[PDB]
């Protein structure tokens, strides 16, 4: 599996942490310590918007599914939600949820006035964007969560947090279904298999794991003997056949999911893979890194 | 055969030992904080370019051949051009090094080290095209000179143009009064990044040897003229290869206690604090 | 899952000695550097002694400098800590400590209120 | 160009976009950037008399310091967004000996960290006045945390200041040297510590920061170009 | 004036004078082949030079 790098998207004055595809599979948010979000027309590489950011320190970002919404957030405990459409023709903040008691480590929508939230003082929260409250607070982690993956069904969504577990919840009751253990270290990214019934975790471990809703338990490991440091972000690709992670060794590894046998490797950036996206018409792979770059291969 | 010529051709070949002697004592100690200090790429080139100079001042002896007088004069012409050219190139580096105020300069590894061979090759190609534009135009020739005397032949070169000869040596002049200026303004720095010799080197070899060879140039004939020619060569390159070198030789292989990364260290901490 | 059990204490009259012993389970034990801490009473937590991977490394605190040990056998995937002249002081609670990253020398959040890769912990009393 | 009227219009909005950046750039490009480090009871709220956040001026240099508190007591995580400052200014209680070791262990972490492998420190021994006073009374020793005081000598490069006490001084550079033979085992030329002895009325620690960021930056430089 | 080099006596005097005899060894060791090589009315002018580089060199010194 080669895959050759068709854009490289310039701009950024720090270290990227977060990215995110939107649903026509042509725009993408991009994050930056700079204290700016960009959004990027990856057919042209062109710069459509440049939204400067309250703080500087922010850690996440999310692409409303409709298009009309942008949302960040990071240090400041704070979850700020941008309206890209307005009459005036700038982009202005639209609302500013606060509630969390630690860094917001990553935020989704489900749809223009619902977003899940999970924050560094280990818990998530499901809020009521027009009203700016807590609709449900998700609690059971011991540790700060760090990433978390919506359904396709948008029914139920993971979460993974730094005491090697991950957890099930229910948006709709706001329980956890079930609690999946097996890594050593901090989980530092999930991701739901296409159909839902499964889900892959990179971890410090240096490990990938995939697990089964209806088995409970994990079912494949990926990992080699050479690598020794840790997953910071992983995704799947549009079949589920391709496990896609990052690492800290400045490279990303293609895994064969369904044999565990590494089949590729994207070697372009020179500092740490802050994040990965893949669209969802599964045509092109963004690679976000800590030297200021964004990607795209295919 | 003639004793002169024998002592030309010994002086020349102990500049080519005592230059490869000092590139491998720099290749040898490749990683340590003296050579790291001086550049080590651009010292490669421009010990190369002393070989050069060597074996440039080697064309001039012997019996006159229309090649040889062609080929004589760019050979010193490029080589001393590049030496002054590597010379430039390093000490504007290290000035913009240490005149910077801001976090990083975020300068490419490999683009800064391209950037100094492209600047280089900027200097040595515009010697490069005035040396093709002269052999292509006015080509030197040898000659069989009967006129100075009655009872003697002088095998010699005649010069196609005096005018070419005239460029090439104005130009290597404003080069070597370029380097004079950037090494006068690096010499405030520590004495690892300093190139403040070279202002020795101008003094000693430019206003004081090659002056005191101008009327010897003026009106002379015969073998003495190539006598001069290669003196002044050796002259030039020795007192290179001394001003540059020598004394970093010396702390790199007596006294070998001062090539420590602690020494470096205090020495540029001394500079920021004044 | 991530499992440290300490064992071996109890109450012991001053100048006495008294082994620890932590036994580790859930994941590769000789890829993870080890601590001991301890928590008396009205008191935080305290950093006591640490061991390396391959236990070329060994680091105490202050109070506990010549009186105690630390030791790890990878082989068993079990720590040790010998306690000898022990003052009325070392009175506390003991845990075994993991760093949260394997091939690393920095361990932060070990002494931490909330740890996950911790344990109960064995009360010494002197 | 094979490009419509709207592609063209879009590609000068982007072209704008790019100015607008490259006017931050230079802006963002002179600011330093500081974190401030060091537990409670130590002071490092007040070190310049010039919370998240805060703005310093110094001979037209521009300085930004960040305390963050925030957060909870774990620091495993977020500590990695601070991996370009150019400096960690760790402020240590010198007057306390119940806590020393704590300091010191937590210098240790920051030290040999991952992330921060190249970031220099700036360590202010903070209460020197605490520390003088705490020695000349002589209720509180070192010895009984410290067993290897006793076997100490005050260094030979030592600066009294005009007016002191030996036993002052020795204590003074003991608490010194722990933090220097730290920061002296892993550093490998990367990165390095600069210690100051600073009370509660000291007001010349926005020029030592200054100097230190310049000798900072100087070094980076070197490396950078592959000098050093 | 090579013994005490480094001394600082007399705003540092010594390494003055050391490169002031340097260039007055320069001089003459350059002046030998040049004169060797001089033919006709400048014979004269080489000596000159001379009378001139080494005075102006201790004066500068
Ligand atoms: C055909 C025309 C030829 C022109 C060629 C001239 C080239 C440029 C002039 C340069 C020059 C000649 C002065 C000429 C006198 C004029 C006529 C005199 C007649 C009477 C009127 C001016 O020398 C001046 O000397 C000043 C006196 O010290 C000094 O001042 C300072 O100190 C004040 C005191 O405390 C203080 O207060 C003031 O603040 C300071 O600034 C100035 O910085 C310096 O410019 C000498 O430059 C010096 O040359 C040295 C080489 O030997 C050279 O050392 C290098 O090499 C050494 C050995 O390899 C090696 O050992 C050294 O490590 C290495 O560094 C020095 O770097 C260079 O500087
Ligand atoms: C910053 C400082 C160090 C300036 C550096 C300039 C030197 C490299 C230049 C200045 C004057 C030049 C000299 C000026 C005049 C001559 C005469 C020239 O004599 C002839 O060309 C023969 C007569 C003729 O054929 O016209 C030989 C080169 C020479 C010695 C030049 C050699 C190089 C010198 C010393
Ligand atoms: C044919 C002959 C007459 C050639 C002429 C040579 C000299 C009359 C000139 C040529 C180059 C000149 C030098 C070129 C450069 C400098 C550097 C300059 O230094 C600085 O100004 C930098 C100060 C700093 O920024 O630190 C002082 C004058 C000086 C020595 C000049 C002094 C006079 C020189 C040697
Ligand atoms: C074939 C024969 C007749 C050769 C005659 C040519 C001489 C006029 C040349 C040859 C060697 C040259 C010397 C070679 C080396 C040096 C070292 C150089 O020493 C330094 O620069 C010391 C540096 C410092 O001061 O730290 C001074 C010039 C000098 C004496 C050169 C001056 C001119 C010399 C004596
Ligand atoms: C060629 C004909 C037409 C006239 C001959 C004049 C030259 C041979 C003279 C005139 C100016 C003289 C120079 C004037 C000043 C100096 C400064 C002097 O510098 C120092 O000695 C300072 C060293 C220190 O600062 O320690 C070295 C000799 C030199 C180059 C002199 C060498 C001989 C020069 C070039
Ligand atoms: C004509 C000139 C340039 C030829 C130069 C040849 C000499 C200077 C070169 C040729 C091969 C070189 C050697 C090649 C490899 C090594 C191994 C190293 O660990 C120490 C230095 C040493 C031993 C080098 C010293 C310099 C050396 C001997
Ligand atoms: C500060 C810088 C510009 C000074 C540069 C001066 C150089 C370019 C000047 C100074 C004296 C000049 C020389 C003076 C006399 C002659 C004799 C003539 O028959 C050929 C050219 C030649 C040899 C000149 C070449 C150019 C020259 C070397
Ligand atoms: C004409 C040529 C070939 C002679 C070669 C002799 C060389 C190798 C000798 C002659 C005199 C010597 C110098 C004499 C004095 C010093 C000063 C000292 O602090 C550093 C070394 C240094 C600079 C010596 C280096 C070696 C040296 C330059
Ligand atoms: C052809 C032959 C005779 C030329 C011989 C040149 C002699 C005079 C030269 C060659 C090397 C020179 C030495 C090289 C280096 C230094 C170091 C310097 O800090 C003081 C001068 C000193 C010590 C020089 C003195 C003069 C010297 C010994
Ligand atoms: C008239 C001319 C040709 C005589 C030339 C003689 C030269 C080669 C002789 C005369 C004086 C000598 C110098 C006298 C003093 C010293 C200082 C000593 O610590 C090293 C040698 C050194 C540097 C000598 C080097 C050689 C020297 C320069
Ligand atoms: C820098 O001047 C040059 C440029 C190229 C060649 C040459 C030489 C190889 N031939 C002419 C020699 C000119 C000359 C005569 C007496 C004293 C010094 C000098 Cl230099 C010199």
């Known amino acids: 599996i080669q895959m050759r790098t068709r854009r490289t998207l310039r701009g950024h004055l720090a270290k990227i942490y977060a990215m995110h595809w939107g649903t026509d599979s042509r725009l993408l948010v991009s994050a930056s310590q700079d204290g700016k979000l960009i959004i990027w027309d990856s057919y042209t590489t062109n710069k459509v918007h440049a939204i400067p950011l309250r703080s500087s320190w922010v850690m996440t970002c999310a692409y409303a599914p409709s298009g009309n919404y942008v949302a960040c957030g990071g240090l400041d405990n704070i979850c700020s939600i941008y309206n890209l459409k307005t009459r005036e023709g700038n982009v202005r903040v639209s609302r500013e949820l606060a509630g969390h008691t630690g860094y917001l480590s990553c935020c989704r929508f489900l749809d223009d006035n619902q977003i899940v939230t999970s924050s560094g003082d280990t818990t998530c929260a499901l809020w009521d964007i027009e009203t700016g409250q807590q609709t449900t607070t998700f609690t059971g982690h011991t540790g700060d969560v760090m990433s978390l993956s919506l359904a396709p069904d948008t029914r139920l969504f993971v979460s993974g947090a730094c005491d090697a577990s991950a957890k099930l919840w229910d948006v709709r009751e706001g329980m956890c279904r079930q609690t999946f253990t097996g890594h050593e270290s901090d989980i530092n990214a999930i991701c739901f298999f296409p159909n839902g019934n499964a889900f892959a975790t990179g971890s410090d471990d240096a490990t990938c794991r995939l697990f089964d809703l209806r088995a409970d338990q994990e079912l494949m490991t990926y990992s080699h003997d050479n690598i020794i440091c840790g997953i910071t972000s992983v995704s799947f690709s549009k079949s589920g056949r391709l496990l896609l992670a990052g690492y800290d060794d400045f490279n990303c590894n293609v895994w064969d999911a369904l044999k565990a046998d590494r089949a590729g490797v994207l070697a372009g950036h020179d500092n740490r893979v802050s994040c990965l996206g893949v669209t969802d018409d599964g045509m092109a792979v963004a690679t976000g890194s800590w030297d200021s770059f964004l990607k795209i291969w295919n | 055969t003639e004793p002169f010529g024998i002592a030309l051709t010994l002086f020349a070949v102990l500049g080519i030992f005592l230059t490869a002697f000092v590139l491998g004592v720099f290749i040898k100690f490749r990683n340590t904080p003296i050579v790291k200090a001086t550049n080590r790429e651009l010292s490669y080139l421009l010990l190369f370019s002393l070989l050069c100079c060597f074996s440039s001042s080697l064309f001039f002896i012997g019996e006159p051949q229309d090649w040889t007088c062609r080929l004589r004069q760019p050979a010193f012409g490029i080589s001393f051009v590049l030496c002054i050219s590597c010379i430039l190139v390093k000490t504007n580096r290290v000035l913009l090094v240490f005149e910077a105020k801001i976090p990083t300069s975020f300068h490419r590894k490999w683009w800064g080290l391209n950037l100094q061979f492209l600047l280089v090759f900027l200097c040595t190609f515009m010697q490069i095209v005035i040396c093709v534009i002269w052999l292509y135009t006015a080509p030197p020739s040898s000659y069989r000179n009967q006129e100075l005397e009655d009872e003697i032949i002088f095998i010699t070169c005649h010069e196609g143009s005096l005018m070419a000869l005239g460029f090439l040596i104005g130009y290597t002049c404003l080069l070597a009064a370029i380097c004079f200026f950037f090494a006068f303004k690096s010499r405030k720095l520590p004495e690892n990044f300093n190139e403040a010799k070279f202002i020795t080197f101008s003094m000693l070899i430019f206003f004081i040897v090659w002056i005191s060879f101008i009327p010897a140039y003026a009106s002379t004939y015969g073998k003495f003229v190539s006598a001069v020619e290669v003196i002044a060569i050796l002259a030039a390159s020795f007192g290179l290869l001394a001003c540059i070198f020598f004394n970093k030789i010396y702390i790199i292989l007596f006294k070998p206690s001062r090539n420590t990364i602690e020494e470096v260290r205090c020495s540029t901490a001394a500079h920021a604090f004044k | 899952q991530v499992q440290l059990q300490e064992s071996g204490g109890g109450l012991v009259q001053p100048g006495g000695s008294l082994r620890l012993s932590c036994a580790a389970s859930?994941?590769?034990?000789?890829?993870?550097?080890m601590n001991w801490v301890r928590q008396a009473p009205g008191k935080g937590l305290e950093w006591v002694s640490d061991?390396?991977?391959?236990?070329?490394?060994?680091s105490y605190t202050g109070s506990v400098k010549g009186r105690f040990t630390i030791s790890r056998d990878n082989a068993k995937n079990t720590l040790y800590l010998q306690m000898n002249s022990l003052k009325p002081e070392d009175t506390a609670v003991y845990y075994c400590?993991?760093?949260?990253?394997?091939?690393?020398?920095?361990?932060?959040?070990?002494?931490?209120?909330?740890?996950?890769?911790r344990g109960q912990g064995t009360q010494v009393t002197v | 160009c094979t490009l419509s009227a709207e592609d063209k219009a879009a590609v000068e909005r982007s072209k704008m976009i790019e100015k607008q950046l490259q006017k931050d750039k230079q802006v963002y490009r002179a600011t330093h950037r500081l974190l401030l480090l060091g537990a409670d009871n130590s002071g490092k709220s007040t070190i310049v008399k010039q919370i998240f956040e805060t703005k310093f001026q110094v001979d037209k240099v521009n300085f930004h310091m960040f305390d963050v508190g925030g957060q909870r007591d774990e620091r495993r995580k977020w500590i990695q967004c601070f991996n370009d400052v150019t400096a960690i200014i760790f402020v240590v209680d010198s007057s306390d000996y119940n806590r020393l070791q704590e300091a010191l262990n937590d210098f240790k972490s920051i030290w040999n960290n991952r992330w921060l492998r190249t970031i220099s420190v700036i360590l202010f021994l903070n209460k020197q006045d605490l520390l003088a006073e705490k020695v000349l009374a002589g209720k509180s020793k070192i010895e009984d945390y410290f067993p290897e005081f006793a076997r100490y000598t005050t260094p030979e490069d030592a600066t009294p200041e005009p007016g002191e006490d030996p036993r002052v001084t020795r204590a003074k550079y003991f608490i010194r040297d722990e933090f220097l033979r730290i920061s002296t085992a892993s550093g490998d030329g990367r990165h390095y510590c600069y210690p100051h002895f600073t009370c509660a009325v000291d007001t010349e620690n926005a020029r030592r920061i200054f100097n230190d960021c310049k000798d900072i930056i100087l070094q980076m430089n070197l490396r950078e170009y592959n000098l050093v | 004036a090579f013994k005490s080099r480094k001394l600082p006596e007399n705003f540092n005097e010594a390494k003055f004078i050391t490169f002031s005899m340097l260039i007055f060894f320069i001089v003459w060791i350059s002046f030998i082949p040049a004169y060797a090589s001089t033919y006709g009315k400048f014979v004269s002018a080489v000596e000159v030079i001379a009378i001139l580089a080494a005075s102006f060199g201790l004066l500068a010194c």
């Open positions: 400590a993991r760093c949260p990253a394997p091939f690393t020398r920095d361990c932060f959040d070990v002494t931490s209120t909330t740890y996950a890769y």
């Open positions: 859930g994941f590769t034990f000789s890829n993870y550097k």
């Open positions: 061991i390396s991977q391959s236990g070329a490394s060994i």
